[PDB]
Amino acid sequence: GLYKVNEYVDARDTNMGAWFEAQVVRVTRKAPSRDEPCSSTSRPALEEDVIYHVKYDDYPENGVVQMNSRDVRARARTIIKWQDLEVGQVVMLNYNPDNPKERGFWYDAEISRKRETRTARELYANVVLGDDSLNDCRIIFVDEVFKIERPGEGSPMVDNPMRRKSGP
């Protein structure tokens, strides 16, 4: 457990498929450790199959939930503008899978098309859900869409914290 008691990282829930910036408040090992970590708690890995006790800052009412490193990724603090959106590029946006024209839970989208008119910069992308995907959906949220953190290209949140708290 390498994440600290003040480590608010982006916990991608696999079940609903939605990203939520969750606050790591405790790390525990898959070895006998239910309380505050002790007795040589040095347990790193490539993808740590150890239990990060996080709290969705997007839904504080969920309280402390258990998520592993494979589940909790670093929130890449980079808002991608329309002109930086390009074909093949996957980016995370506040998206309602009930209505693409309204915001909701943070999902992925692979940019398929981009066409600006003098009334608005219009975007159409394959919005990637839990394991599913929604090809050619209007991306209204081009002003506030973040990037997916790639191997090397993934910039960490060292600058001003977001902690978007997506819980309408």
UniProtKB/Swiss-Prot annotation:
Induction and repression of expression: Up-regulated in proliferating cells, and down-regulated in quiescent cells. Down-regulated upon adriamycin-induced DNA damage, in a p53/TP53 and CDKN1A-dependent way. Induced by E2F1 transcription factor.
Post-translational modification: Phosphorylation at Ser-166 of the linker region decreases the binding to H3K9me3.
Keyword list, A-Z: Acetylation, Cell cycle, Chromatin regulator, DNA damage, DNA repair, DNA-binding, Isopeptide bond, Metal-binding, Nucleus, Phosphoprotein, Repeat, Repressor, Transcription, Transcription regulation, Transferase, Ubl conjugation, Ubl conjugation pathway, Zinc, Zinc-finger
Record GO biological process: DNA damage response; double-strand break repair via homologous recombination; epigenetic regulation of gene expression; heterochromatin formation; homologous recombination; mitotic spindle assembly; negative regulation of gene expression via chromosomal CpG island methylation; negative regulation of transcription by RNA polymerase II
Modified residues (Phosphoserine): 33, 155, 166
Location(s), subcellular: Nucleus
Keyword DNA repair belongs to the record: yes
Tissue specificity of this protein: Expressed in thymus, bone marrow, testis, lung and heart. Overexpressed in breast cancer.
Effect of mutating residue 58 to A: Slightly impaired binding to histone H3
Keyword Methyltransferase assigned: no
Taxonomy, superkingdom: Eukaryota
Ranges for region Tudor-like 2: 84-151
Region (Linker): 164-168
GO cellular component: chromatin; euchromatin; heterochromatin; nuclear matrix; nucleoplasm; nucleus; replication fork; spindle
Effect of residue 20 to A: Impaired binding to histone H3
Crosslink site: Glycyl lysine isopeptide (Lys-Gly) (interchain with G-Cter in SUMO2): 147
Bridged cysteine pairs (disulfide): none
Region (Tudor-like 1): 1-77
Subunit structure: Interacts with DNMT3A and DNMT3B. Interacts with DNMT1; the interaction is direct. Interacts with USP7; leading to its deubiquitination. Interacts with histone H3. Interacts with HDAC1, but not with HDAC2. Interacts with BLTP3A. Interacts with PML. Interacts with EHMT2. Binds hemimethylated CpG containing oligonucleotides. Interacts with ZNF263; recruited to the SIX3 promoter along with other proteins involved in chromatin modification and transcriptional corepression where it contributes to transcriptional repression. Interacts with UHRF2. Interacts with FANCD2.
Job description of the protein: Multidomain protein that acts as a key epigenetic regulator by bridging DNA methylation and chromatin modification. Specifically recognizes and binds hemimethylated DNA at replication forks via its YDG domain and recruits DNMT1 methyltransferase to ensure faithful propagation of the DNA methylation patterns through DNA replication.
Domain notes: The tudor-like regions specifically recognize and bind histone H3 unmethylated at 'Arg-2' (H3R2me0), while the PHD-type zinc finger specifically recognizes and binds histone H3 trimethylated at 'Lys-9' (H3K9me3). The tudor-like regions simultaneously recognizes H3K9me3 through a conserved aromatic cage in the first tudor-like subdomain and unmodified H3K4 (H3K4me0) within a groove between the tandem subdomains.
Record disease entry: Defects in UHRF1 may be a cause of cancers. Overexpressed in many different forms of human cancers, including bladder, breast, cervical, colorectal and prostate cancers, as well as pancreatic adenocarcinomas, rhabdomyosarcomas and gliomas. Plays an important role in the correlation of histone modification and gene silencing in cancer progression. Expression is associated with a poor prognosis in patients with various cancers, suggesting that it participates in cancer progression.
Name by which UniProt lists this protein: E3 ubiquitin-protein ligase UHRF1
Origin species: Homo sapiens
Gene: UHRF1
Residues of the whole record sequence present: 133 to 300 of 793
